[PDB]
């Protein structure tokens, strides 16, 4: 509300809010946050990166997005929970100072503005993005099948109106083009992660083909070290392991995309529930659920550093 203080972090908020939330957290700490204006959305909204960071020029950073899908609500609320736990735990907990000494981090908490504000407006499970099309009725795109990576292979629809459409061509989505040219024009992430749920899954390259990627074994050892931090708060199980063999195939999506841009540590999280609640996770799960995240964030993040 009037500070990051007061802010009610154990309910969902709107996109107002959420944005008025990043405005609060730069002002408090101007000389660790900065608000970044990437791009604009579909439908003019702009497109927000909070950027943390000590100092130094293009230092190594790591990069986190949440809420691609627009209805998995339990992302975008743990967006805004990271983003305020970074500013208390630097100085405090000794091993996320040493990272953000070193490394600088990149938060979106909205990457689809338009399909959230969607959701609040109109359709609570809306997932895609709100372009329009002339060839069809239907709209918007699967942002995330919309990466150059296996673009329009099995694993996604050429048909606008499906839920998984991959859109006219790799990039299309402003919203996605956006973050394609940042991270490229930057050029030293050396992590990835998006945040989605729900499924409980920590997962890796790839989704759009069956080739193991050369890294399969520090990656899989780094996944299963943060799955173990991650249970060890509240014994959330998760499982682990790339895309295609945990899940299905699936094209376009972006950790593949990051992955072959030469960023390593490419990973995908699918948090809280099994399928009790699904997208409509209760308001007071969001506090544990983004406590628990957290530790297996640090535990990759630390392997990165």
């Not at 050396?190 to 989704?207: E, N, R, T, V």
């Not at 759009?208 to 399969?216: C, F, L």
């Not at 376009?252 to 990973?267: A, V």
């Amino acid at each position: 509300a009037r500070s990051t203080n007061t802010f009610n972090y154990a309910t969902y908020h709107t996109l107002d809010e959420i944005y008025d939330f990043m405005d609060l957290l730069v002002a408090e700490h101007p000389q660790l946050v900065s608000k970044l204006q990437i791009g604009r959305s579909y439908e003019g909204r702009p497109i927000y990166v909070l950027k943390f960071s000590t100092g130094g020029s293009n230092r190594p950073a790591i990069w986190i997005d949440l809420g691609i899908h627009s209805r998995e609500w339990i992302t975008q609320a743990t967006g805004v929970w990271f983003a305020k736990k970074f500013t208390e735990d630097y100085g405090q907990d000794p091993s996320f100072t040493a990272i953000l000494d070193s490394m600088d981090i990149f938060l979106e908490i909205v990457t689809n503005p338009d399909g959230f504000a969607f959701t609040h407006s109109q359709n609570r499970l809306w997932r895609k993005t709100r372009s329009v099309t002339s060839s069809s009725l239907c709209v918007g795109v699967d942002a995330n099948r919309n990466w150059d990576a296996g673009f329009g292979k099995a694993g996604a629809s050429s048909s606008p109106c499906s839920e998984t459409y991959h859109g006219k061509y790799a990039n299309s989505e402003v919203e996605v083009k956006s973050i394609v040219d940042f991270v490229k024009d930057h050029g030293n992430f050396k992590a990835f992660l998006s945040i989605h749920s729900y499924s409980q899954l920590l997962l890796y390259p790839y989704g759009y083909t069956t080739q193991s990627i050369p890294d399969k074994t520090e990656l899989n050892q780094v996944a299963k070290s943060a799955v173990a931090a991650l249970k060890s708060l509240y014994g959330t199980s998760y499982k682990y392991g790339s895309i295609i063999t945990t899940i299905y195939q699936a094209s376009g999506g972006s950790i593949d995309w990051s992955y072959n841009q030469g960023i390593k540590y490419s990973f995908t999280f699918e948090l809280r529930d099994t399928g009790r609640y699904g997208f409509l996770l209760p308001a007071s799960q969001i506090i544990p659920t983004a406590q628990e995240t957290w530790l297996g964030v640090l535990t990759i993040m630390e392997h990165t550093v």
